[PDB]
Amino acid sequence: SMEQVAMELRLTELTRLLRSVLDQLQDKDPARIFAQPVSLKEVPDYLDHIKHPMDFATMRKRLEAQGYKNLHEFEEDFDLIIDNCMKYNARDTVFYRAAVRLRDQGGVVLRQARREVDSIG
């Protein structure tokens, strides 16, 4: 159906906008602290602590499979990156400190992306 194709064109366009958002958020992590999943070889107990791991690479795989239906879903995964880090690591650590900065810096990017998604439908 032509409806199914129009809905697909919207998913694709959302996917293009989210790829750009994702790039912008990841530039706010110049140390690549959140680039890849926490290693279970190196933190073998990690899943006893964190039930839903997240990282930018795993977001990116979901994104290119057009697995985000809306901004809310993408924001959920971004928030996991930050929240997981802020529970597992203590306040006085380079890791926690990097999440706070990502959170604060990403807030601006996310504010405008919400407006763009609303605006362009």
Instruction: Report the CATH number at residue 40.
Output: 1.20.920.10
Half-sphere exposure of 109 (CA within 13 A, CB side): 22
* Technique used: X-ray
Rounded to whole angstroms, the Cα distance separating 36 from 27 reads 14
Residue range of the domain that includes 43: 1-121
User: Is the CB of residue 34 less than 8 Å from the CB of residue 85?
Assistant: yes
Neighbours of 106 (CB within 10 A): 23
**Number of neighbours of residue 102 by Cβ within 10 angstroms:** 20
Phi-psi region of 90 (alpha: psi -120 to 50; beta: other; left: phi over 0): beta
Q: How many domains does the chain have?
A: 1
CA distances from 114 to 27, 32, 58, 108 (A): 19, 25, 22, 10
Contact status, residue 45 vs residue 66, Cβ threshold 8 Å: no
CB atoms within 10 A of CB 99: 22
What's at 111, amino acid-wise? R
